[PDB]
Every structure is written in structure tokens, then in C-alpha cells.
Design a binder for this molecule. Sequence first.
Ligand SMILES: O=C(O)[C@H]1CCCN1
Ligand SMILES: O=C(O)[C@H]1CCCN1
Ligand code: NA
Ligand code: NA
Lengths: 516, 516
Amino acid sequence: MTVEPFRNEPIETFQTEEARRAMREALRRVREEFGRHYPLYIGGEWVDTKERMVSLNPSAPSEVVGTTAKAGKAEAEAALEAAWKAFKTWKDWPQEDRSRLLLKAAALMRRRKRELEATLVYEVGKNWVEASADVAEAIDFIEYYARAALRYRYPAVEVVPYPGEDNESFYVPLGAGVVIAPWNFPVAIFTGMIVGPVAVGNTVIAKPAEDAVVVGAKVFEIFHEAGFPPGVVNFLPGVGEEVGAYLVEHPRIRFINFTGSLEVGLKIYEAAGRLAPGQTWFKRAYVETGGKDAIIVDETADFDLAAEGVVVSAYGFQGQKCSAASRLILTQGAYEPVLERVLKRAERLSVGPAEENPDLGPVVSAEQERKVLSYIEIGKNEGQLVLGGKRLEGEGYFIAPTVFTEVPPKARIAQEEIFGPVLSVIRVKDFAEALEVANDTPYGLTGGVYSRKREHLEWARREFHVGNLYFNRKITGALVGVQPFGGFKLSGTNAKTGALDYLRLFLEMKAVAERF
Amino acid sequence: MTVEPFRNEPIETFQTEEARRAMREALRRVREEFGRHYPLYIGGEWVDTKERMVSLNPSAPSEVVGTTAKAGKAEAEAALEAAWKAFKTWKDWPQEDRSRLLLKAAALMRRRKRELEATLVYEVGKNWVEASADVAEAIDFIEYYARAALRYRYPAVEVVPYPGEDNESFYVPLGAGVVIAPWNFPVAIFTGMIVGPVAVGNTVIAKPAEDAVVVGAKVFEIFHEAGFPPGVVNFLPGVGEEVGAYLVEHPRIRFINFTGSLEVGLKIYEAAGRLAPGQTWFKRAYVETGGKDAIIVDETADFDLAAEGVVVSAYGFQGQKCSAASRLILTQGAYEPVLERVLKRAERLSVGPAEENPDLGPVVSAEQERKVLSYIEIGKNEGQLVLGGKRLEGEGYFIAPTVFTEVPPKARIAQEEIFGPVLSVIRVKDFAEALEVANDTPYGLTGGVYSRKREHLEWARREFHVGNLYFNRKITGALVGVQPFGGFKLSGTNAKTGALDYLRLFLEMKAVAERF
Ligand SMILES: O=C(O)[C@H]1CCCN1
Ligand SMILES: O=C(O)[C@H]1CCCN1
Ligand code: NA
Ligand code: NA
């Protein structure tokens, strides 16, 4: 199968009048369909339940964006039987056929871009450009993985020949597994975590994050339309842990793909290590469990370049990114000139309802707002509050961009992932000290360095122990294919998304010899 | 660096006068050294202890083959310290230097071939060809991995460019880990499990199986003379579960490479999924946990060629292989002609002191004899004993080649790994039933099919669910490079040894962007 070489889907900036016009319409149509009900998806049909989940607009939480069915253990078991039955024949599709199905999916997604972006603005409170980047990334995962999957096609493995024999080594998929997706990239990470495993012949039961069930149902409208056979992909919104614990601990669950908090990722990893009664394999678990990411700036840097990238990485999507700059480690001669520039920029940021395209929208939920307001209370005792520190006026969950300065490297707010628009500034002496501080957390996801000294950049390259490292640019927004995404230490298992290596995690190898 | 294309090390058949003479000279050298004491090897030096381990000759267990030091928690902690300090600089060797160290180690091992073979004969009871296959496989792992490592060298990852940026992805080693090696391939698997991780910049602490501590020590003599920096490889003989429990559970052990029984592998994988107090990473555990491997023969087969391969597969090294044919599944047309031919061939096998080059030597230890004889006792209750089934005379742990027939598919002897010279014969109507019966076990390591019907062979390639399938030939003897070796289901985690993909297990990836 021959297609164009992979390119990244361009990210809409809404500067042209046709873009704005297209978006204003998209938003109106999505707002005009608030209250829509989306059932479960199991074995190729939408299955409804007596209980229901409500999804609210974090910009105005009295508004229900939509409701979905709610999955129990029974629904999980049914889905799991539909996934297994599907697998018997889905593993047998020529790779070319599976990859064409992904390409159809991506073209359908692209045709529904504006509607998807609009649903993200309302359901999870992204501004226009964050919602566009999310959707572009989801399209990218499908286009990329459709292509990557063919590099594993029958028989892919390079092996040493032997006289008188044929030795053929090949990859087979694993079986039926479960995906537990995050609310902060509920189009992009939801999509890639499902479509990677499926591309190569696995089948998946997907559990969307509670805050993002409606946008997850819209991705399933795309799968259904694309024409995945019954039970290949299954959609099971539910509340709290019933559904995910049932599948994570289940003997017939083959693998688990998780993106989310460390707390859950640790329980998950430990549970996958156990042989459930009557289980007949060693479960694989791929977990990406967040970060406490830092940007180092030395006194050789472009300070206005730096201040810009820090504000973007600290405050893009209200700091709600596994990849957000939550730490600003400043060397002695960088401290004042960078800090004042970051403060002058950060004080100019608008906060408001996500539909208005503010610099920052709301945090995702009443839970997140409490969690973030509580960390800000803790930071008031650990560092010096110099910007924000407060909830803004409104019923939506608005939080001012917050800066702490003179933060001790070992403070809670310099160790623990806040996931909100909260930056900690840490003063250090020199660039060696900067690296020690950068490396001294339990995490290793993203990290950045602003500097013009080549020797400092190349030193960071070899010693700044993070999976995704960026020099002289923001540390968020890793592009599929360009920057393999995934971390070290308790940022997770280093399962590098948007890379060719990701798909190997979902395949096993068979070696077959025929002596003639 | 440029070396010859990989070839497998020829296995000595001892058909020439020079080779028989070279074997007798090496057997003589080895036994004159039975009085030797071998210390621990920690931080590039031999380190003795007060306690000692004794190694006995399974063919003459009143005869000691050597003694070693005995490590406990404290030498393990010391080796762990030494291994992490080594890693700090060993991770930074150019790959070409690390690969040349391996090639050097391989050349020492090839020059000491007969000595190691002779050590395997006296220490673990291998006949002369089994021993030579084992040493040749160790040399192959050092040669294969030295070359395979370089495919991973800086910057190996294929990524999509982006305008105005350099995007570089590359592999870095994990850290210090522990290898827990088996007694049945105490040169080959021992060497592979250590040098694979080490080739790519990991450091290793090796605990050999108690039954094979003397040949492990001699492999460390090689490591030492080749010049591995202090701390890179460490040798910790121990008794019982002290040393390996300590280290598998340790917060600062990065990965675990394990080959042994399912029982112990299940614990290790459960252990590895736990975050020890103050652990800052998700442990990687690689486990190969045995098999209950079957050869199917249908009525179109070459019946003499089948019976030859079955005997080799079932009785090679007394059946003490994860790859051993321990089930023989015969279709109705094939049952009589194949069973009689196997009985005729198995009845002319010799058993005796391994150094006489019998077809079978002893089982490895008193405890192995117990286990095997105990299964023979269960076997008598479950099917028909029709050859063997008994201990043979001599203090050596000699057991007769044993065959049970009319074994139900789900009988214990058809399900549990016995690891001794015991074959269970299963009668089935046709190939469809034959394949059901082959698949119906907890395991999925090796398998075999004898048949001239292409459709049955090509059906099996697709649906005989074992990681190493062999047609019209033996099912043991997987060659490094040729047949990537590792299993499905409870045969472990499909870590394919002697394969390019093996080294990827000991790496993580970093992605570094510079925006110019
Ligand atoms: O924010 C980022 O860097 C990428 C990682 C996965 C979601 N988007
Ligand atoms: O016997 C075999 O099949 C190979 C696997 C590893 C040891 N020798
Ligand atoms: Na919502
Ligand atoms: Na011994």
C-alpha cells in the first residue's frame, strides 16, 4: 500500500477570517447540541444502560455538554467477550487491510476537525489552538501508526540463514487488552492508545476519562463509520474504578495501556504483575504517569525567547499537561532578568470561558480546582507567592496563573505534579547545580534548556535525564513522528508514542523452521 | 568497526582422532583441578568469604568438582554498589569499544572451548556433544550481541524532520540489573543473559544456579581476562533464595533477567511490579519459565525420521531442557508405526557417566532425581508405562529413558513440566485434534510437527501457538541468530534471545530537539 510520506497535520491558528468563521460555526453547532446522549459501544453497536453519566462544561458547570451510558462489570465482561471473538479474525487481516481502515478513520476525523475542536473547547475547556493541536495530534497518531504497522508485516524479522532450512520469524498480535485514557488529551491520547494496538491486530476495550466521555463517544462515531469489524474497538465510559479494576485484574485481559496519574499507574503496574486465577500469560502494562518538568535558563540565553517559552509551557492548557513546565530553574545571572520577563508576560494572560479563546480557560472539574487550590495553599507556606494564587470570579473553574519564587528543590510544590497553572521558580548557582536540581525528582518526562553555550546544551543532552528534551523552545506539544514521546523513572515505562517502537510493545514473535 | 558477517560456532561431533584426543586432554586437565576454590567476583576482583559452596559430579556424587564462595545480603549490596559506580562511566563507552570487549571475550572463550565443555561434562552431566553445543551457543551469544548492539548506536532512531530544528532520538542503557541463570545451560544461557544487557551499557550482577557454580566461575575468568572494567559484571554464587530475593526486591535494582521454573518466575514478575520503598522507576523483568512441548506426527510423515527427531528432542541432555519434547501427539494413522519406532530407538540408548559420552548421562542432582521419580510414580497412575520408568545402578543420578502411552491430554504428566527423560504419548483422531491437544497447556515455548502435507504444516505455522515451531526436524537446539528463542503464555515474556529485539529490552529512548 502506497500513500504519501507522513506529514504532521497543520495546527490551526485561526488568524485568517475563513478559520474564525469556520470555528464560530463549529462552536455554535456544538453548543446547540448540548445535552445529547451517547450510549456504550460494544461489538459494533451502541448499547445503552439504565444508569447515566453527566459531562459538564468547566467554563460554566451548570451546562450539561452531554450524557453517556455508564458501564458496569457486566458491560466490561460483554465487551471483553466481543473483543476476544473479534480478535480470532482481526489478527488474520492482511496488515495492508488494517492500515487502510486506519487511513479511512483519519480522513473521517480530518473531515470532522472543527467539530472535534469545538467539543474539546466546551467539554474540557481548551482554548481554540489547544483544541486544534489535540485534534491534529489524534489525526497524526492514525496516519503515523497506519504507516509504522506495515514495517512489522509478514515476515519482518531479520534472521541468520541455515543450510537445508527455511527459518522464518514473524510478529503476531497479543489479543484483547484495555486502554485507560486521560482527560487532558481526550482526542489525541485516547486515539493513539487505541489505534496503535489495533493497527497491528489487537482488539481493545477503551475506558475514557470521566471528564471527557462525550468527545470519546465522537471518536467512536468515527470508528463505527470507518468500519472496524464488531468488537475490534469497544467504548466503556463508567464512574470511578469498577470498570477499570475489573479489566485490569481480569485473567483474560492480555495487556493494559494507561496514561494518567502516578497513583493509578503504580497500582496498575503492580496488578499486571500478578497471575489472576486461571490466567495463562504474563500481562504487559504500558503506563505513562506524568512528570515534574523543568526549564533551565542560563545567563547566556535569549531572555525574551526564554520568558516566552516558559509562559507557553507553564500555562498552555492551564498547565494541565504531562509535559508542562512546572519548574523554572534559574542560574544566578539569569534569575532577575528572566523572572521579571516571565512575570510581565504571565500577568498579561487572559483567563476566561474557553469559547472566547482566552489565553487560559478553566481547570477541568471541581475536583481539579480543589486539588490545584489546595497545592497553592501548600506553596504559600513553601515559597514566596509573586503572581496569582487565587480562584477568579465566576461559576466556571477559573484559576489565575500562579508563580512561586525562592522554592526549595525539595518542597512539595517542586516535587509533586500539580497539573494546574502553577510555576515554581528555583534559584541555583551555575549550570551544574541547574542539572542536579532538574534531575533530582522522582520523574523524567520533559525538560528544557535555554542557553546559547554549546557546551551546556550538549551537557544537558547527555545528562538532563528526561525522555523528551528541548533546547531553545517550549517543552510541550511533542509532534507525532518527530519527537517520540515518553519518559524515564516514575514518568512511566518509556513506551515511546508517535514512534515506530511503540507498536512492537503490542506484538509477540514466532520463529518457524522447516527442515526440507 | 568491521568484522566478518556473523556465523554460528560449529558444534564439535568428535568424529576425528584429534578432537577425541583434544577432549581427553581437556577432561584430564579439568579433573586435576577438582581441588580448586572459586571466589565471588565483585568490582573487578575475586572476593572470598568464610562460608563455601560445594559442587558435586552428578555421575559420581561422592566426587567434588570444586568449591566456591557463598554470597549473602552483604556481598550482594556490595556488588550492587560496585555495579552502579561502573554504570556511570560504562554507559559512555562508544558502542564500538563495548562491542570489541565482547569480541575479545568470545575469542578467549573459543580458545578455552574444550576446558569449558569438559567442565560441563563433570559438573552438570552433559555428554560430549551436548557440552559442545552449550559452549558453542555461549560463543554465538557474545558474537551475535557484539554485532547486534551496533545497530543501536548513537543516534539510531528514525524520526520525521521538522523545519528549523534538529530532532535526534537515541537509546541509552537502563542501569544495573540482576541475572538469575539456570543450571541446564550454565555456560550459554548464563553468558547470553549477562552479555546482552552489558553490550549496550548496562551493568550486571550474575547469580549462577547452585548446580553449576564452577563453570559460571570459569566464565568469569574469561570476563576478567578480556578486561571488563571493575563493576560491569559481578559473580555471586549463593545458596537458596537469599541473594536473588534481596536483589529482585531491591529499590535500586533496575531490571531482572531470569531463566528457570515457572514457580520462581511468577514470584519474580509479581515482585518486579511493586515499587520497593524509595524506588524511583518501574522495574523491567524478563522471564523464561519453561515449557510442556509437543511433537505432532501425522500419517503422511516420514515415520523413521520422525522417530529419530522425537528421541533427540525427548532425551537430549536427559530431557532437562525447556525445549525438550515431553509430549508426543500422534494421529490415528501415525500412532502404531511411530510409537514402535520410538520404542525401538529409545531402547538402544545408553545411560552412564557423562564423560564416557553415553547417549544420556545422569540427571543433575539428588533433588532432580526425586522430582523425576515422583512424576514417574504419578505417571504410572495416569497412563501406561511402556519403557523405562526406573533408576539405574550407580551412585550417579542415572534414570532410564521413559515412555508413557494412552496419556489423557489433561493428566498431570501431559501438563506439568517434569524436566527429566520422560515422554508422554497422546493418541488423537486427526490433525485438527492434534493441534487442539498441542495448544491445550499453560505453556507455549517449543513445538514440532512431522508431516509431508503442506496444508497441515502451513496450518500449524498459523495456529500451533508456540514461539519456536520446527517442521520435520528436532525441536531443541535453537541456534543463536537463526531461531530467535523465547515463548508465549506461561513460557515467559517472549524476550527473544539470539535476536536483534533482545537488546532493545535493555535500552530506553531519549528524544532531544534543538530549535536553532
Ligand atoms: O503535550 C505534549 O507534549 C504531547 C504529549 C502527548 C500529548 N501531547
Ligand atoms: O535447547 C534449545 O532449544 C536452546 C534454547 C536455549 C538453550 N538452547
Ligand atoms: Na466535562
Ligand atoms: Na553440581
